[PDB]
Every structure is written in C-alpha cells, then in structure tokens.
Ligand binder design. Structure first.
Ligand SMILES: N[C@@H](CCC(=O)N[C@@H](CS)C(=O)NCC(=O)O)C(=O)O
Ligand SMILES: N[C@@H](CCC(=O)N[C@@H](CS)C(=O)NCC(=O)O)C(=O)O
Ligand SMILES: CCCCCCCCCCCC[N+](C)(C)[O-]
Ligand SMILES: CCCCCCCCCCCC[N+](C)(C)[O-]
Ligand SMILES: CCCCCCCCCCCC[N+](C)(C)[O-]
Ligand SMILES: CCCCCCCCCCCC[N+](C)(C)[O-]
Lengths: 598, 600
C-alpha cells in the first residue's frame, strides 16, 4: 500500500480510487465513456492517413483520370471527415470526463480539509491569508493541469506510439520502426534535460519578479513617508534596478524556451528526412506506392504533435505529482490527540474541574507545569494568576485538550477528559480568549456560531446577555451586518462582547476567561467586567488574568509559581499571608501609581 | 494628437509603439529590425517548403522529365525536411532576438506609471492591502506580456501568411479556392470570437465561485482554534463543501464550452479542407493540376490554420491585455494636483522662519477647515499648535510638506512662498515625527538611513544614539541588519517612534515637526520619548501639534486654534492667566487624568 517507492506511481495509484469512486456509478460510466472516446478517437486518427494514401494511390494507379476520379474524391472526403471526427471524439472525451475530474479533486481537497481539522494545533496555523491563498491556488491549478496532461496527452500518445510501432512494423522498415523509436527516445530525453534547466531559470525569474514587485508595493503603501523624505527618485531607482534584474532573468528563461523548440525540431526533422527519403527509395524499387510517402509523413506529424508540448507537460506533471503527494502526506500525518476507542460521552452533572499532578510542556525540551494540582468547586468564581514562569497560559489549552499532559490528568466532574469524546468535553466548556476573532460573515453568523442549530431568538438573547444588543440594533442591517474584513470593523470591546455572546449561545456549565480583558483599554475593561460577572452567574468560572485587581472579587484565587500551585485563597487571605500574591499585588499597585504620576 | 482619438485598442497600441521603437536606444531598434527579418525569412521558408513536397510527389508520378526520379524526389524530400527545421529555427530566433525589446518596453511602461503614481495626490490614499494589489499587478503583468507576444508573434505572422496564401492560391488555382478559404477564415474568426465572449463570461463566474470556496477554506484554517472551541469541524466541512460544489459546477460548464469551440473550429476547417482537396483532385482529372498539387494545397491549409488553433485564447488575452494597458495609460494621463511651477527656484533657508499668511483650505471644496489662519513661527523657537476638535490643526503638517495647496493665502519659509519653489528643496527643509510611523520591509538600519540618500554607517549610528534606540539595536542578534516592518520583527510604538526620530536626525533638517508624535504611545513611553524629542529639537525650529497640552506646556509659545483660526497665542502661564480657551482645555484635561488616576 503506502509501503512503496513513493514515486509518481504511488501518488497516482493512491489517486486512482478518486477517479473510479465505487461510491458513484454515474461517474464510473462517465469514465468508461471517456475511455471509449479515447479509443474511437485514436482509431479515427490512425485510419484517416490511410484514406489520404489511397486517394494519392488512385491518382497514380494510374493510366488516366478514369474511374479513379470517383475513388480519389471519395477518399479525400473520407480523410477530411476523419479529421473532423477525430477532433469531435477528443472534445467529447474531455466533456464526458470533466465532471469525474472535478469530483475527484474536490473529494481530495475535502479529505485534506477534514484531516487538517483533526490535526494538532502545534502546526501553528498562523500565517498570511494572501500567501496561503496563493499557495492553494497555485497548487489546485497544478493538480488540475497535471491530471489533464496525464489523461489526455501522455496516455493517448502512448497508445498512438504503440499503434504506429505496430503499423510501421507490418507495412515498412523495419528500419522505419527503429528510426522512429530512436527519434522518440532522443526527443524525450532532450526535452527532459532542457526542461530541468528551464525550470531552474523559471524559478530564478519568479523570485526576481517577486522582489521588484515587493519594492514597488512597499513604496506605494509608504507614499507618505516617501514624500516626507522627498525620496521619489530614490524609490524609482530602487524599483528600476530590481526590474532590470527581473527582465534579465526573464530574457534568459524565454530564450531557453527557444533552444528547447529548436532542439525538438532538429530531432523531429532528422526523423522526417530519414523516413521520407527511405520511403521514396522504397518507392523507386516498386516496393511502396507514392501514397506511402504521404502516409508516413502524416503518421509522423500526427505522432509528434502532442509531443510538441512535452516540456511544459513534463514540468506540469512533475509539479502536480509533487503537490498531490503533499496532499496525501497531510492525510497520512498522525493525530496527536485522539479519542480512546469507544470513548463515552462526558456527562456533566456537577461542574468541578480538577488538575491532578499535571506535568506538561509544548515541547519535550521545555517543561512548563511540573506537577500542577488544584481543585475548582462547581459553581465557584476562581482566578488563576502568577508571575512569568507560572505556566497559567497552558490551562485553557489543556482543559480543551488541545494537548494531553505528559503526566497526570484533568478531570471534569469525576471524569478524566482524556477518556471521553473530545466533542462532549468541548461541548461542556466556554471560552472568551484574549484576541477574539470574527469570521468573514454577518454578526449573526458570528454569534450563532456558539451552537450548531442556534435560532435568531437565541442570538438576540445572547447578544442581550453580552450587552451588545443595542449596538447591533443601531446598525442598518442589524444582525445581518457583515463584519471582519471586508466588513464593518468592531472595537475591541464590541469584539469581546461578540465572543461573550457566542459563549452564551453555547451556554456551557464551565466558562473560562482567558486573559479576556488583556487587550482592552481601562474603561473598556471595567465596563466588560460587570458583563462578565453577570455572565458567570450559574457557571463554574475560571479567569486567567495578568492584572490582579480585575480578579480580586473572586471566590478564591489560585496562585501559580514555577508550574505548581504556590498559594491559595481569597484576595484578603492572600494579602494577609504576605506571600507571592501580596508582592505581585503591591508591585502592580505601585506601578498603577507611577503611571498616574505622569 | 494621438490622445485626441477614439478610446479603443488601436489607440492603446499606437501609444505603446514608441516603447517598442525607443529612438533612445538604437540597439533595440536593430533588434526589432532583426526580428522582423526573422518573420520574413520564416514565412518565406514555410511558404517554400510545401512546393518542395509538391515537386517530390510530382517527380514520382511524372518521371517523364524529372529523371532520375529517385534523385529528384530524394533531393526534394530533404529540401522539405530542412525547410521545416529552418522555419522553426527562424521563429525561435525572432523570439530570442525580440525578447529584450519586449521586456524593456514593458519595464519602461511600468517605470513610467510608478513615477506618475508617486507624483499623484495624497487624497487617492494609496495605502491599501499588499496581497490584493500584488495579485492584481501579477495578473496584469502576465496579461500585458501574453497580449504582446500573441500580437507580435501570432496575429501579425498569420496576417502575413494569410495574404501570401491568398496571392499564391490566386496565381495558381481557383479562384474558387481563394474565395472558399477567405470565407472559411471569416467564418472561423467570427465563430471563435462569438463563442469566446460566452466562454469568458463563464470563466469569470467560475473564478468568482473559486475565490469564495477558497476564502471559506482559508478562514476556517486560520481560525482553527475557534473552530475547535465550538466543535464546528463538521459545520466548516459542510460549509466548504457547498461552495466547492458550486465551483465544480461552474468549472464543468466552463471547460465544456472549450470542447464546443474546438468542435465548431474543426467543422469550419474541415469543410474547407474537403472542398479544397476535392476541387484540387477534380482539377487534376482535367489535366489542369498535378497530383503533387493536392499535397501542396492540403499542406498550405493546415499550415494556415495551425496558429488559428489558438484563436480563442489569443482573442481573450489580447483583449484583456489591451484593457490593462489602457488602465496604465489612464494613470499616466491623470493630472497632478501639486506640481512645481515652471523653472521653480530652490527654497533657500538662511533663517528658518515659518509663516501662515491668511490660509484658507479644506480637503474637499464643500468643507472648508481653515478660514484665514495666520501665524508666525520665529526662527529657532519651539512652538506648539493646539486646539479643540474643529481647529484644523491636523492640516498644518500636510500643508507644510505641500501635500496640498491653500485655496487662498500662502505659506512661507524664510520669506519664500512654498508654492513657488521646488518641492524637493522644500521637503529637504522639513523633518517630521508623525503619529504613526511606518517602516519599510527592510532592515532597521535601512529604515534609519532612509533619512538621507547617501547615509553612512556612522551617521546612522549617531542618529540611533540620539534617538536612544542604539542600545535596543545592539541587543538584536542581527543588529542593524535585522529585518523589520510586517514580514519582519515587530517594534513597539516607542521603538518605531524612536526609529522616526533617528530618521530625521540623519536628515538633519533646519525645521522639525512633531505631528501628534506621542499620541499613540502609552503614558510612560510618552514621558520617556518626550525627553528624547526635546534633545533633538535643540537648535531647530520646532512645531509640535499635540492633543494633550501637558506634553507641550514647556513651549516657547503656544498657538491655539479655534474654528480654523488663531484664537489664542502665548506662553503656557500667560494662557492660563487669560482664562480663555487654552485654560478651559487645560482644566478639562487635568480633570480627566485625575479621574483616570482615581480608578486604580
Ligand atoms: N515545445 C514546448 C512547448 C511549446 C508551446 O508552449 N507552444 C504553444 C502552446 S502548447 C505556446 O505556448 N505558444 C504558441 C507558439 O508560439 O507556438 C515544450 O515542449 O514545452
Ligand atoms: N481552439 C481553442 C483552444 C486552443 C488551445 O488551448 N490550444 C493549446 C494551447 S496551450 C492546448 O492547450 N491544447 C490542448 C491539448 O491539445 O491538450 C482556442 O482557439 O483557443
Ligand atoms: C479542486 C482542486 C483541489 C486540490 C487541492 C490542492 C491544493 C494544493 C496545495 C499544494 C501545496 C504544496 N507545496 C508546499 C509543495 O507547495
Ligand atoms: C496599481 C497598478 C499600477 C502598478 C504599476 C507599478 C509598477 C511596478 C509593478 C509592475 C511590474 C512589476 N513586475 C511584475 C513586472 O515585476
Ligand atoms: C507594464 C506592466 C505592469 C502591469 C500592471 C498591472 C495592470 C492591471 C490593472 C488593473 C486594472 C483593472 N482592469 C484593467 C483589470 O480592469
Ligand atoms: C495548507 C494548504 C494545503 C491544504 C488545502 C486545503 C483544502 C481545500 C483547498 C481549497 C481548494 C480551492 N478550490 C480550487 C477548490 O476552489
């Protein structure tokens, strides 16, 4: 299976079930019809040169223009109709097959999409929208062009080349056969080597192009700064040098295309000269008719027409196979966090959260939690704080099981979250993260995202609870207002309110505020804190905060130091104990004073 | 005037022609001539080679006077093969010879537009998204290149060959042959064009559906965490799938139409082939034509219609190219709001005073902001300009750098109207630390050296020191060679502002503007950077435009604007004593900070 050479053959054999689905009957029928079109088309293009030969034969055999006019007429007509029929068959196979192609590449993409959602967070999917888009565009284009060239150029040419070998064998040579075979081998080898060199030149050109373009764009988007320093000539010279470098590379890349074409024509035309001279010589001895000259010439040109593109074809097919392999690699990549076999659903009857001796790090060379243990009572409002090495920033990710502990475990109610389904576990948890993100869609879509079947009543209710309802009401399109980019831009508080609303639609027993106010300004922070407190009403709530004053009203505060639970208690108990929390508090307090001094 | 004409493809091409025939270079003109010569050799060759095939066939079938016919036929078969190879050689040689001319032409067009865009007004607000603009420019470049290649190396050669075939068919056949082929070419072009219009519309729909499916997929992938938090994997999968199906449907229709165009084309071509060949054989029957004539006619027709096999695509590309190029020329034609007057002298700053003399201005003609603003900034003084929300203070710097001109009134530096001097000297006299400094996608050292064209490593080190960012840079692993901006290391607000300060230090202008320089900063960063700003403002004329009065309280004098005019002027203490607009503002601002300080 996967236990193979990992060449194009493996990738292709892997792709084969997509083309011959065994899910879909209609598509299989389409495949068969396309293959029939290939065969009819080839039979037609192989037959038509014979008709041309006979027409010439009739006009040379040959005392006069006698009953032979009728014969010659019939045969040229057969030839022309043959040409049209060949093209008709080719275009009909493309037309029949196209749906199969489209479904196959769609299903491949969907499989990759699904596996990517199953894969680990640590792949760190944080990148540029335009760049990933450019990569995906280039790649889909790649796989499509490859697929088309393999099925509809290379394969028909293999059939045709074999047929020409047999026919040339039975009717000529067999010096003809070896001559053509050598011509084809020299042709492919030359095209291949020249193409490898060409692909390198292309890559250099593409890079230089990107550089000239980047300079131009950076300049235009910094028009103000350029004016401030009167730097127009400078930026112009800067674009110009880059542009020249690009143009030089482009001239080389294109010229190499000229060289490939010339090499190809040399090979074809040596073959043509040889075949035709030899055919004429065979004519002189009465072995071959004059029509044979026409016949061989047509067979050779027809054979070498698809090979006119072989370079591009080669490049394309190669790249496609690469890209497709990349796809399959993702599908194969193993999943770090998985449900255990026959994992039960998590049943939340009493929403306690337990960390039991948790040892964890994102990477095995940097341990962060060194045996963290704590208990959060059901329905309590708890805070988790600490200085720079505490490891509090792992809590949310562990609770949602983005990762597993190296040692120890997390429990919700009485149950190890590692032994339940990921879906039930996440169904029980709400989060308002530090940087809330909006989908490129309406505000209603964004709020309703909290639960799958969320009704507009639920959206209104959540928006009310998050106290963002009025702001939406004063929008012309209300809930149907598009947001994100390209959409309406929300303030930080408005975004955090959309996130809160989203979690309200979910209505989870356990709610986490994960540095929820850390990006907000002071007034925004203070405003949203009453909403958060209200929204924590009958939930078990865990708030991870940098700034202690924002969580001082907690039922209890867990203080972490060096990946372990250092101190525990109410804000007052902790101030009395005069330990780490008190120091932190004093420190922050002092700092708040200093800023106010200015 | 060539611009005084209909706005079509012909005009665009006529505009582009000087680029191809520079009259600056001569080397390139010689290259163009050489390329045209290769077109002619190539056409003579491809026209000549079928006669060689014809003769070879003629020799074999009429060996009466063409003897030894084996020798004659061999010679002709070899002439035919050599003719083919030679045709290809001539064609690739015209491409190879011309390519430099093409690249230079399009480079010069791009450079012309680039210069023009830097000349055009700020109000166009060119700052927009990088990826979108880049994708557009890539698409356009490919478009114009492809158009140029198809125009020069496909359409034009085919026009030459078509005329030649018409003449040759005329002289040796028909002339039913001539009319048949011409009608065929006409039917071919008309069919291809009309089918291509439909095809292009389908292509656009396909592309739009493609972009929507891709955007859904990308939004999901970059929001993997959110998708996880809400268990939305199935929803995202289904949401991608529906879009993907819409795209696949569009793609299927779009590809299928290509099959239709190919069939229509082959139908036309093959009617012409059947008729022409049948006619040639019938002419043979009457002793009018040789059998080699059949080979000759057939070969001529296939050679003719081979470039036309691409006519659909060609038509789509050339058209698109012509559109894109027109857009280029449109930008080049767009007029320049702010230009130097003819023969403008340099601004000569011997004593760097600044005057606003009765200035009336607005960004737009329906909304006037300054209503007769007048003030004098003494040479070497440090002054501030403050006011409430409609004061118009945010126009001052833009007017000084002459991003816009006054509707009425004028601005002077050292007694010289800045409207009447070269823009480059004027801007040479001015330094600015703006509210949001922007960095080039380049090294931090490049960004600092940007202050002056020939900036040495020493000048940069000195500026980094004066801006007090030198230590921060020293602690960078790559130092001055550290890449910054987007696509690079992220600097804090203070670090960026310090880079801006360092830039102006490298420039060393006589007049310095702080244009809300500290307004985006946090309080402590503001307090830190203010001492730096005071140091660099040492012996310069400094004008500080600030929202928060406490940051400018130490000014030599303060200009208070209200409603686009100068309401109040004087020292901070004098303004507090007058108990007017500045005092009110001062009190108000103090009050707010107190309340803010209260909320700890
Ligand atoms: N022979 C070259 C391909 C030649 C080629 O690309 N020809 C057509 C398209 S298939 C073209 O791009 N331009 C038409 C022409 O100038 O011949 C190769 O093997 O890659
Ligand atoms: N006849 C159509 C299509 C021509 C076409 O696409 N020709 C080459 C251009 S590179 C090609 O791709 N042929 C497809 C094939 O033979 O596989 C037109 O006039 O544009
Ligand atoms: C309908 C087409 C669906 C197929 C999906 C193909 C996307 C291609 C991405 C390949 C990227 C691989 N890489 C890194 C080598 O560029
Ligand atoms: C916004 C459209 C106008 C952009 C023109 C500016 C010229 C620089 C980029 C165009 C050509 C660069 N390229 C792609 C050939 O390297
Ligand atoms: C000379 C090379 C520079 C190429 C610049 C790209 C041109 C594209 C202009 C886009 C304008 C919109 N349009 C023409 C597609 O309708
Ligand atoms: C990170 C890139 C590799 C995986 C790509 C994700 C699969 C879905 C890609 C969407 C394909 C776009 N198209 C052509 C179907 O519209």
């Amino acid at each position: 299976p996967k236990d193979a050479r990992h060449d194009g053959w493996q990738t292709l054999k892997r792709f084969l079930p997509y083309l011959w689905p065994a899910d879909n009957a209609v598509l299989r029928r389409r495949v068969v019809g396309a293959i029939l079109m290939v065969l009819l088309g080839k039979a037609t293009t192989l037959a038509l040169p014979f008709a041309y030969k006979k027409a010439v034969d009739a006009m040379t055999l040959g005392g006069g223009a006698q009953p032979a006019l009728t014969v010659a007429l019939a045969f040229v007509l057969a030839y022309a109709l043959g040409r049209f029929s060949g093209v008709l068959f080719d275009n009909l196979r493309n037309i029949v097959f196209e749906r199969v192609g489209q479904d196959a590449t769609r299903h491949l993409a969907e499989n990759v999409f699904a596996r990517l959602h199953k894969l680990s967070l640590r792949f760190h999917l944080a990148r540029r929208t335009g760049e990933v888009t450019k990569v995906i565009e280039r790649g889909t284009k790649s796989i499509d062009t490859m697929l088309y060239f393999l099925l509809f150029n290379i394969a028909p040419t293999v059939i045709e080349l074999t047929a020409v070998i047999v026919i040339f064998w039975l009717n000529f040579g067999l010096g003809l056969v070896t001559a053509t075979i050598l011509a084809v081998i020299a042709y492919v080898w030359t095209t291949r080597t020249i193409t490898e060199w060409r692909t390198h030149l292309r890559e250099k050109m593409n890079r230089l192009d990107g550089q000239a373009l980047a300079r131009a764009v950076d300049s235009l988007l910094n028009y103000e700064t350029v004016k401030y320093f009167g730097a127009e000539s400078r930026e112009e010279a800067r674009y110009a040098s880059a542009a020249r470098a690009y143009a030089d590379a482009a001239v080389k890349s294109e010229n190499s295309l000229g060289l490939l074409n010339i090499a190809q024509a040399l090979i074809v035309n040596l073959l043509m000269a040889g075949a035709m001279a030899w055919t004429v010589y065979g004519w002189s001895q009465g072995k071959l008719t004059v029509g044979d000259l026409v016949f061989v010439n047509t067979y050779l040109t027809q054979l070498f027409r698809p090979l006119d593109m072989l370079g591009m074809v080669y490049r394309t097919i190669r790249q496609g196979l690469i890209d497709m392999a990349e796809m399959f690699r993702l599908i194969d990549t193993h999943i770090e966090v998985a449900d255990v076999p026959n994992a039960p659903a998590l049943v939340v009857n009493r929403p306690s959260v337990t960390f039991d001796n948790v040892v964890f790090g994102y990477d095995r060379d940097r341990e962060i939690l060194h045996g963290l243990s704590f208990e959060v009572a059901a329905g309590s409002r708890v805070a988790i704080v600490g200085p720079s090495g505490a490891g509090k920033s792992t809590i949310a990710r562990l609770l949602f099981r983005f990762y597993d502990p190296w040692e120890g475990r997390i429990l919700i109610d009485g149950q190890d979250i590692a032994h339940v389904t990921q879906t039930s576990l996440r169904a029980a948890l709400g989060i308002v993260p530090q940087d809330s993100v909006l989908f490129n869609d309406t505000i209603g879509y964004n709020i309703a995202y909290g639960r799958d079947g969320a009704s507009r009543a639920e959206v209104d209710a959540a928006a009310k609870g998050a106290a963002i309802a009025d702001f939406i009401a004063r929008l012309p399109q209300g809930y149907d207002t598009e947001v994100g980019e390209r959409g309406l831009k929300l303030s930080g508080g408005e975004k955090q309110r959309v996130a809160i609303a989203r979690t309200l639609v979910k209505n989870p027993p356990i709610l986490l505020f994960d540095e929820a106010t850390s990006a907000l300004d002071t007034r925004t922070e203070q405003d949203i804190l009453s909403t958060m407190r209200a929204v924590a009403s009958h939930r078990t709530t865990i708030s991870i905060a940098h700034r202690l004053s924002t969580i001082a009203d907690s039922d209890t505060i867990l203080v972490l130091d060096q990946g372990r639970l250092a101190e525990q208690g109410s804000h007052l108990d902790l101030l009395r104990r005069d330990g780490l929390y008190a120091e932190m508090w004093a420190r922050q307090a002092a700092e708040s004073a200093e800023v106010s001094e200015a």
